[PDB]
Design a protein that fits this description.
The protein is of the alpha+beta class. The protein has a single domain, classed as Glutaredoxin, CATH 3.40.30.10. The protein has eight helices and five strands, in the order ββααβαααααββα. It has a five-stranded mixed sheet, sandwiched between helices. The longest helix has 17 residues.
Length: 188
Amino acid sequence: AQYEDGKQYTTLEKPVAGAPQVLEFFSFFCPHCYQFEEVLHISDNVKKKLPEGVKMTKYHVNFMGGDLGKDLTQAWAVAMALGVEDKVTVPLFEGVQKTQTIRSASDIRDVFINAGIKGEEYDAAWNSFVVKSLVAQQEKAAADVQLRGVPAMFVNGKYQLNPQGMDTSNMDVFVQQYADTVKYLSEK
């Protein structure tokens, strides 16, 4: 057929109950993730093609970048709690991978300050139990699918996107295949 298990996607032999509908994992240390965000705009193009009523979720992971990797997962929890994802995603990616000016939790904090989040508001969130439980949620979602690599996207806790089984000559064409595949899995 056109869409085939093992080609554009794989099926989880161990499906995850109650999972978010469209669930993306990334790391600010992940080179393909940088491409996905700043060059390909994957999340955005997926969103534009998703049906009525389908929520999109994106979580950070711990398994890259050691101590700073965990800090970034907590900062992403802060970002979600405050609703400022669209203000910090680009400077966090560039701070980690392009300028390499993010080397500590303080440097992460600076990105939020520069983006206009008040320090006192950042620090309150950082230390909050709501953020602790948002960290727990990110960790549990990743653990549930035995996640070993990013970028990754899962649909209804049962299908995992398989971008290696897609064309990459043209960047635009890859992005729409990825998005169209998500829509298909969505409607499945």
